[PDB]
Amino acid sequence: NRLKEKYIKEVTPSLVEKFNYSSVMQTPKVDKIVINMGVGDAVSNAKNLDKAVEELALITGQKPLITKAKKSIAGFRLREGMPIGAKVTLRGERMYEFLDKLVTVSLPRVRDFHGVSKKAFDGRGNYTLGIKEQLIFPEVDYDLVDKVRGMDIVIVTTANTDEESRELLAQLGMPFQ
Amino acid sequence: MRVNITLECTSCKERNYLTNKNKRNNPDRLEKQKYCPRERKVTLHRETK
Amino acid sequence: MLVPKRVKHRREFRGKMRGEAKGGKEVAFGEWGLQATESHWITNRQIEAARIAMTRYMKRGGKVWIKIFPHKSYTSKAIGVRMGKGKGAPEGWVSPVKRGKIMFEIAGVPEEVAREALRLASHKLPVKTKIVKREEMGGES
Amino acid sequence: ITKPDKNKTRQKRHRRVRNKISGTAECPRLNIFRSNKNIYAQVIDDVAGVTLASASALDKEISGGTKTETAAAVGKLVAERAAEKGIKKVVFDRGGYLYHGRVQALAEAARENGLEF
Amino acid sequence: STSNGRDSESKRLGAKSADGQTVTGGSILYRQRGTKIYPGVNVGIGGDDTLFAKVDGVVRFERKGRDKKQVSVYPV
RNA sequence: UGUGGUGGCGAUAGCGAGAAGGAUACACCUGUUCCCAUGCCGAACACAGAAGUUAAGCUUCUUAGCGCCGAUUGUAGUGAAGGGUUUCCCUUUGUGAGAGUAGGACGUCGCCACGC
RNA sequence: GGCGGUCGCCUCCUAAAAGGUAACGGAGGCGCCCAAAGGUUCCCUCAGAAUGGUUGGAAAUCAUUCGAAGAGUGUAAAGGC
RNA sequence: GAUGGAGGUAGAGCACUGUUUGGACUAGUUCAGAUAAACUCCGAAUGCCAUUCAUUUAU
Ligand SMILES: [Zn+2]
C-alpha cells in the first residue's frame, strides 16, 4: 500500500547501507501492532468494558478480544476470570493504515509536543507508545465519550540492536523528539 | 442435595439402572439412551417420578 | 541462648551419637582451634558460658567463631507424674558433638592470650579437649 | 521475535502419534513426508528397521498437474508398487499433520488401488 | 491424654513374581502407587497401577532408557 | 561420495563459543481466488505458487568453559568368629562405598531416495 | 480403679533397604463431590524474573528475552505425571 | 555354591525441602563451613524371591 513502496524505494537501500547488510533478508521490518486497554473497572460497573470495546472498534475494523483476570488478588476485588480489558492485534495492511493515521493525522492533536520518549525500547528493538485519552483520532466523536481514558500501544519489529529500530521507526514517521 | 435414583425404561417399563444426581443442579429428570436387557436394544430410559 | 527460629517438628528422637565427627575437623577461619576428644551433648547455656569467658579475656578484641549450633530439642515430664501418656513438653536445646569436632576458633591475638582463653573456655564444658593450630596445606598464610 | 521452525513443532506431534502406531512385517507402516514443494511416502517395518517400497512426488514421473493432484498420483504409485511385494495390510502414520488436505489425497488413492487400512 | 493414635491397614505392596520365573496368563507381577515400574512386552496395567501378564512365559525385569524400569514376559 | 527422509542404542549422543555452505534436495520468502481457519488477527493451521536469499533454521567442521561416563588404592559401614566398661570402644577373617581423583568424550550402528 | 480421652476407615514416620510388626508413641484426613470435574478425537504448555507502557499503585491487563518444572493435578499425605 | 532380580536402611551428601555460621557484595548474586525421624544427586554388608543348575542330606 503506502509504505511497501516506501520500504523498497527509500528505506531498504538506506538501512542496507548504514549497517552494510550483506543480504536484504537482514533488513528489519514491522511484524505486529498490538493495542491494549487496561479497564480494571468491570470490578465495579459491568458496563465499562463495553465502552472500551466500542471505542477500540471505532478505531479499527475488528472486534477486540477480552482479557480476563488470570489470577485473583484481593487488593482490587479480583477473583479469577473476571473480564478486565480488551486487546487488538494488527497485521499486514491494518498496520500500515494505522501507522499512517498515527503519524499524519491523529498524534499531533496531542499538545505540548514531547513526541516520543527514548527510554521506550525494551533494550531489544521493539517500541511501545502511550496515549492518555481517546479524542486524538478522527474515528472518535465529541459527545459520545465520557471518560478520560486512553490506550496502550506496542509496535514489535525484527531488530537486534535498539538503534536499528530507532532509525527504521523514525524513518517511517513516529515524530520522536 | 445429592440423591440416589432409578432410571426406568420407556417402552417395556423396567427399572434397569441405579445412579446419582444433584437435584439443585439438575432440577428436571435425567434422560439417557441405555441398553435395555429385556428387549436387547438401546432405548430411552427415564427417571422415576 | 541460641534458639532455632521456626522448627518443623515439635518433638523428636534423641540417639545415637556413636562418635566420629562428620564435618569440621580442621580450622577454617581462625588461627587456633579447640577440638573435642570425647562425645557428648552440648547445650545453649554451656556455649554461652564458654563464649563469654573466652571474649572477656581478650581486651582489644580479636575475633571468635562459634562453630556448633543447637538444632535438636529436649523434652521432659514433671515430678509426681506416673509413666504413660505422650511425650513431655520441650525444655531446652542441644547439639550432639562427636570426637574430632573443632568447636571454637580465635584470631588476631598472639599465642598466650589465645591459649589462656581456650583454657578458660574448656572448664565450662562437659568434654575433654585439645588446642590446635592451622598446620600445613598449599596455603596457610 | 523468534519464529520457530515448523518441522520441530511437527516432530513433537509425530512422536505422540507413534506411541500407538507401529509397523510389523504383516502390517507395515505407511509413513508420509510433506515438504514445501513435494510429498513422499515409504512403507516401513520396524522389527527389522527397513523399507519395503516407496514413491516420491516429483522425483520420478508423476506430473500432469501442480495442485493437490500431485499427491493422489503418489498414493496410487505406492499402492501398485506395494501390491507388487505382496502387501495389503498397512497402518497409516499421518506424520504430525492433519488428516485433511493433500495427505488425505495420498491416503485415499492408497485405499483405491490395493492397500487395506 | 494424647491426640495421636491411629493408622491404616498395611497394603502388601511390592513384587509378586521373581525374575526368571515362569508364569501363567493373568498372574500379578507388581503392586504399586503410580508407575514406579512400567509395563513392557506382553504386560498390562490395572486400574490402580498393578501390572499383570497377558501370556504365559518368563518374567524379566529390565531398564527403560536412563532412569526407568520395565517388566516383560517372553513365551518359550 | 553429498543431501533429503525414517530407525535402534543410558547425553561418551547434550549446552555455549567459532567458522563455512546452496549442485539437486530442505528452508525462509510471495499471495488469498477455491478446501479449511482466528474465542481479534491467512500470526498459526489450509491451500495456490516460485520473484527474491543464504541472514535465520538445516548440514559440515574447530573448541573440553557447563553438563554427562568415569577406574585404581585408601578410608566409613558391615556377614562370621572373640575381648574390655558395657553409654561406648578394640582385635582377627570376609565384603566395601559416598567423596576425591588418573582417564574418556564434540557420537556410533542400519535401511530407502536422488544427485557425483 | 475413678475423672480425662479413645472405640470403624485412609496417608506418612517409628519399621532394623522383600512382606509383616507394639505402646494412653510422633503428625494429618474421611462418613463426600462432579451430567462434567465422565468417554473419545483434534490441538496446546507451566511458576516466576528482568525491560519498557496512560490512568495503575510493588502487585489487575499488554510486548520481548531467560526459565525441567521452582506450577497444576475436586478434596489429607505419600508414590506418580 | 553359581547366576539373575525387587527394595532406599548403615554410611555420607547438600541437587530438593526445613534448621544454620562467617565474608564479599548490591536492588535499593557470590566464596567458603555445617545439620536432619517424618530431607536425598547417591548408596553397602546381610537378609528375601527365583532356576528342567550343582554337591551333600531327609524330609
Ligand atoms: Zn424396555
mmCIF file of C-alpha atoms (C1' of nucleotides) in Angstrom, chain D residues 3 5-8 10-11 13-14 18 29 31 33-38 40 42 44 49-51 54 56 59-60 66-68 98 100-102, chain F residues 4-8 15 24-30 33-36 43-50 52 56-58 110-115:
data_model
loop_
_atom_site.group_PDB
_atom_site.id
_atom_site.type_symbol
_atom_site.label_atom_id
_atom_site.label_comp_id
_atom_site.label_asym_id
_atom_site.label_seq_id
_atom_site.Cartn_x
_atom_site.Cartn_y
_atom_site.Cartn_z
ATOM 1 C CA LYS D 3 9.575 -17.781 14.712
ATOM 2 C CA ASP D 5 10.602 -23.920 12.519
ATOM 3 C CA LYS D 6 7.532 -25.943 11.705
ATOM 4 C CA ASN D 7 9.457 -29.192 11.326
ATOM 5 C CA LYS D 8 10.254 -29.355 15.033
ATOM 6 C CA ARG D 10 5.509 -31.452 13.951
ATOM 7 C CA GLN D 11 8.198 -33.782 15.230
ATOM 8 C CA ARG D 13 3.312 -34.268 17.444
ATOM 9 C CA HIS D 14 4.743 -37.136 15.414
ATOM 10 C CA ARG D 18 3.902 -43.120 17.201
ATOM 11 C CA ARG D 29 3.771 -48.641 8.455
ATOM 12 C CA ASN D 31 4.560 -43.008 6.570
ATOM 13 C CA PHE D 33 6.702 -36.626 4.432
ATOM 14 C CA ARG D 34 5.267 -33.298 3.250
ATOM 15 C CA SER D 35 7.675 -30.549 2.214
ATOM 16 C CA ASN D 36 7.136 -27.131 0.653
ATOM 17 C CA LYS D 37 7.028 -28.481 -2.910
ATOM 18 C CA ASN D 38 6.589 -32.266 -2.645
ATOM 19 C CA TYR D 40 6.958 -38.520 -0.170
ATOM 20 C CA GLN D 42 7.624 -45.048 2.480
ATOM 21 C CA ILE D 44 8.262 -49.333 6.754
ATOM 22 C CA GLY D 49 14.129 -51.475 10.657
ATOM 23 C CA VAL D 50 13.787 -51.286 6.879
ATOM 24 C CA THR D 51 11.756 -50.014 3.919
ATOM 25 C CA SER D 54 8.317 -46.178 -1.807
ATOM 26 C CA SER D 56 8.038 -39.780 -4.397
ATOM 27 C CA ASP D 59 11.179 -37.262 -8.338
ATOM 28 C CA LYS D 60 10.392 -39.969 -10.846
ATOM 29 C CA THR D 66 0.661 -28.978 -9.796
ATOM 30 C CA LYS D 67 -2.292 -28.545 -7.483
ATOM 31 C CA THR D 68 -3.034 -31.144 -4.735
ATOM 32 C CA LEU D 98 -3.882 -33.303 9.952
ATOM 33 C CA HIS D 100 -7.214 -33.260 5.978
ATOM 34 C CA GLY D 101 -5.638 -31.794 2.892
ATOM 35 C CA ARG D 102 -3.161 -33.269 0.438
ATOM 36 C "C1'" G F 4 16.527 -35.432 1.907
ATOM 37 C "C1'" G F 5 13.799 -38.997 4.766
ATOM 38 C "C1'" U F 6 12.855 -42.596 8.586
ATOM 39 C "C1'" G F 7 15.007 -46.118 12.791
ATOM 40 C "C1'" G F 8 17.969 -48.658 17.039
ATOM 41 C "C1'" C F 15 24.693 -26.920 26.003
ATOM 42 C "C1'" U F 24 19.699 -31.322 -6.533
ATOM 43 C "C1'" A F 25 17.059 -31.528 -2.106
ATOM 44 C "C1'" C F 26 15.490 -28.521 2.836
ATOM 45 C "C1'" A F 27 14.148 -23.769 4.200
ATOM 46 C "C1'" C F 28 12.960 -18.764 4.614
ATOM 47 C "C1'" C F 29 10.048 -15.824 1.091
ATOM 48 C "C1'" U F 30 5.067 -14.389 -2.078
ATOM 49 C "C1'" U F 33 -9.497 -16.967 -5.975
ATOM 50 C "C1'" C F 34 -11.107 -22.005 -4.363
ATOM 51 C "C1'" C F 35 -10.976 -26.975 0.672
ATOM 52 C "C1'" C F 36 -10.015 -25.226 5.858
ATOM 53 C "C1'" A F 43 0.489 -14.932 13.018
ATOM 54 C "C1'" A F 44 -0.826 -20.261 13.223
ATOM 55 C "C1'" C F 45 -3.171 -24.176 10.773
ATOM 56 C "C1'" A F 46 -5.139 -24.793 4.831
ATOM 57 C "C1'" C F 47 -4.415 -24.099 0.101
ATOM 58 C "C1'" A F 48 -2.350 -21.513 -4.840
ATOM 59 C "C1'" G F 49 2.625 -20.636 -6.095
ATOM 60 C "C1'" A F 50 8.284 -19.721 -7.481
ATOM 61 C "C1'" G F 52 13.862 -12.915 -4.306
ATOM 62 C "C1'" A F 56 17.784 -17.158 10.393
ATOM 63 C "C1'" G F 57 16.539 -22.957 10.782
ATOM 64 C "C1'" C F 58 19.468 -27.220 8.321
ATOM 65 C "C1'" G F 110 21.326 -49.637 9.780
ATOM 66 C "C1'" C F 111 17.511 -49.260 5.706
ATOM 67 C "C1'" C F 112 15.323 -46.034 1.332
ATOM 68 C "C1'" A F 113 15.517 -41.956 -2.479
ATOM 69 C "C1'" C F 114 18.006 -38.840 -5.630
ATOM 70 C "C1'" G F 115 22.453 -36.458 -7.486
#
